[PDB]
Design a protein around this ligand. Structure first.
Ligand SMILES: CC1=[NH+][C@H]2[C@@H](O1)O[C@H](COS(=O)(=O)[O-])[C@@H](O)[C@@H]2O
Ligand code: NA
Ligand code: NA
Length: 694
């Protein structure tokens, strides 16, 4: 038996609405293959393709006229011929692909649908398109007929930088993988008891508002989740401190927009609000809790404060401050979308997340409920007057009557179908639901019984728990009331992108399928079989992931490297890469490499496999998780040593380089053949065809 590429259509995640093999040969991408667009708004889709294929395959994908690859914008694109009695789509995100040996024809209902088409094409090309080095093979798009649209319009990840900051470059790496699986929403949990993570300035304050907002990021940027206030397996390291400057936050929005992802900000209140009291002297007033000590302007960041926070629900300044933070986030979001090449009509998400987590009661100026009803009535009024829809967590529905009509609950705790408050919001107050039930969507829930993490929701919430649910059924409502789903990355215990990606992947790709794929097109075993290729692409991106035991498709894959762009050092040159999750070293890999000259016989070449990092599960030291203890092995660089007499040839020499890999941990060996040209001890050209390209 011998390793081959999976049937390209078999790879697609999320599973599209409709996908069939068309007749005949695949389309071959050439260095100079151009792309035609009907509209400038579709260039961002072409850019997503060029950003990968420029590096992996040397593709220019220049914009041209009468190109074999076309993106056409069709606001009336009709995929309903593929929507059965049992199916439901949000058509704004619909696209089609019709391809053959000669052409690839994309229609997109929106600019965002263009990017989804591009992500599908990059999956069809295969799991090496994020290669950091130019590959020797040419790229092919199979002859296919695809009609696609998502079930749910809202397919998101909550990121919590408030417990522990994530620098902009790490947020971009999350957006990359979110976009790759057609996630369209990045919910930013900007503020908590333990931090505030975006700069707020004093530009454009309301008349007579003399609040100094600049202290918010300066004081509450400098705090984070404290290891010392834990007695469990939480890392010895405190949360990362810091905040995004306005220009960093504008760049975050712009980058998200150019990948089809809208920003949804959350400023949580009246509870989980200690960062606001700690940052703004002005918010310490009326029934705020806790109070600053002996002649202090702001309460101290100390263990007794944790879970005991309340904004002043009875004070005008609370709502002045909230209004200005909302205005400033709105301004930065508009500036981010302006900096993108994507349309505001698609990427400006007219929602604001108030949170609504219960405040702590200390004094006697109201009951917890009454204060929450004051706070969400008044803060709900701010959102409505900015032409936005309010979102609250389950706790916020103690104020279901006070929040505006048409408000949204983000469900995480208990059975939504049986929740009187949720059913009243949906049924009597024209509301809608975003589904984040902890047991199906909370990344800190440990992904396996061998792992260390949060256990309360499932014991271990595996890819099975993340895949095998129906958000509409779980909400006990109709399709039209379900906006969709969000995963949650809470950062009490997270200190790095590597440790976040351990929890996020591959479970996020199950959530992506829940958000996108039709309920009657879902098949956990089929999704499980696609994870092998998902992992090969994550390894190419340098993204970490949990090597879950329930995944049956972990595989090795070999790709020939274009040695023409690699240096020969002491006769050694990089000719291949071998990706296989879980390698603890290279000694379980058996490589055979031969060079066969024109005129020659097979010459065995010494093979030098090189793997920078080895695979490790999580590591505990003194009862606590080590930061980055769980890490994936590197892709193996496969070097051969070329013979001295081939490298000393004053005349060009052509030969065939055949590389075989057998793995102790993956039972299907790979075979690779490419032709190489060598002159003056350097590889000048490689090719995998029967004909040398000219
Ligand atoms: C909406 C909501 N409020 C709480 C709650 O979810 O769980 C989070 C931790 O999740 S975990 O660790 O999976 O249990 C926590 O960070 C957040 O403050
Ligand atoms: Na790909
Ligand atoms: Na080549």
């Amino acid at each position: 038996i011998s390793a081959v590429a999976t049937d390209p259509l078999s790879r697609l995640t999320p599973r599209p609405l409709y996908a069939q093999s068309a007749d005949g040969e695949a389309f071959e991408l050439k260095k100079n293959t151009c792309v035609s667009v009907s509209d400038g708004s579709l260039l961002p889709a072409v850019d997503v393709m060029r950003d990968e294929l420029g590096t992996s395959y040397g593709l220019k994908l220049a914009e041209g006229t009468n190109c074999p690859i076309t993106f056409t914008l069709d606001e009336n694109l009709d995929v309903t011929g593929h929507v059965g009695s049992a199916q439901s789509i949000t058509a704004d995100e619909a696209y089609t692909i019709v391809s053959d040996a000669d052409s690839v024809t994309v229609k997109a209902r929106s600019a965002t649908a263009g990017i989804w088409a591009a992500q599908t094409l990059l999956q069809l090309i295969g799991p090496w398109t994020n290669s950091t080095v130019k590959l020797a093979d040419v790229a092919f798009i199979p002859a296919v007929n695809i009609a696609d649209a998502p079930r749910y319009q809202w397919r998101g990840v909550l990121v919590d930088p408030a417990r522990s900051f994530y620098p902009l470059d790490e947020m971009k790496q999350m957006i990359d993988v979110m976009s790759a699986y057609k996630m369209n929403t990045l919910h930013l949990h900007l503020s908590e008891d333990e931090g505030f993570r975006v700069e707020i300035t004093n530009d454009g304050r309301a008349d007579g508002d003399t609040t100094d907002y600049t202290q918010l990021a300066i004081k509450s940027g400098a705090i984070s989740y404290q290891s010392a206030w834990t007695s469990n397996w939480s890392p010895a390291q405190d949360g990362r401190t810091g905040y995004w400057t306005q220009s960093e936050f504008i760049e975050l929005v712009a980058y998200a927009a150019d990948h089809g992802i809208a920003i949804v900000p959350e400023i949580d209140g009246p509870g989980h609000s200690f960062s606001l009291l700690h940052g703004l002297a002005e918010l310490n007033t009326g029934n705020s809790n806790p109070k600053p000590a002996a002649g202090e302007d702001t309460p101290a960041f100390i263990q007794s404060a944790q879970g005991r926070s309340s904004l002043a629900t009875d004070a005008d300044i609370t709502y002045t401050v909230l209004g200005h933070i909302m205005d400033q986030l709105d301004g930065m979001i508009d500036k981010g979308i302006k900096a993108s090449t994507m349309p505001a009509s698609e990427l400006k998400r007219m929602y604001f997340h108030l949170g609504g987590d219960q405040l702590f009661l200390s004094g006697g100026a109201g009951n917890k409920t009454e204060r929450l009803q004051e706070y969400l009535g008044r803060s709900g009024a701010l959102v409505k007057e900015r032409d936005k829809t309010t979102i609250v967590w389950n706790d916020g529905l103690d104020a279901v009557d006070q929040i505006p009509e048409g408000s949204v609950v983000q469900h995480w705790t208990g059975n939504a179908a049986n929740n009187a408050s949720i059913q009243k919001l949906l049924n009597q107050r024209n509301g809608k639901i975003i589904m984040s039930p902890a047991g199906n969507t909370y990344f800190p829930q440990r992904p396996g019984t061998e792992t260390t993490g949060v256990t309360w929701a499932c014991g271990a919430c595996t890819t099975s728990n993340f895949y095998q649910w129906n958000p509409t059924s779980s909400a006990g409502t109709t399709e039209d009331k379900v906006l969709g789903v969000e995963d949650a990355l809470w950062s009490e215990h997270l200190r790095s992108l590597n440790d976040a990606e351990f929890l996020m992947y591959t479970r996020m790709m199950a959530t992506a399928e829940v958000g996108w794929t039709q309920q009657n097109r879902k098949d956990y075993d089929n999704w499980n079989k696609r994870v092998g290729d998902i992992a090969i692409d994550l390894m190419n991106r340098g993204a970490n992931f949990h090597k879950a035991t329930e995944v049956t498709s972990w595989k090795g894959s070999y790709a020939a490297v274009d040695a023409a762009e690699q240096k020969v050092t002491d006769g050694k040159v990089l000719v291949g890469r071998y990706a296989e999750p879980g390698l603890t070293g290279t000694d379980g890999l058996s490589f055979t490499a031969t060079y066969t000259a024109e005129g020659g016989t097979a010459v065995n070449l010494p093979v030098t496999p090189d793997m920078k990092q080895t695979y490790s599960q999580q590591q505990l030291k003194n009862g606590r998780l080590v930061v980055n203890g769980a890490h994936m092995n590197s892709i193996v660089d496969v070097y051969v040593t070329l013979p001295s007499d081939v490298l000393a040839a004053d005349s060009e020499a052509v030969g065939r380089l055949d590389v075989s890999v057998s793995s102790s941990t993956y039972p299907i060996p790979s075979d690779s053949s490419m032709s190489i040209a060598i002159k003056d001890g350097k590889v000048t050209q490689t090719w995998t065809g029967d004909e040398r390209p000219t």
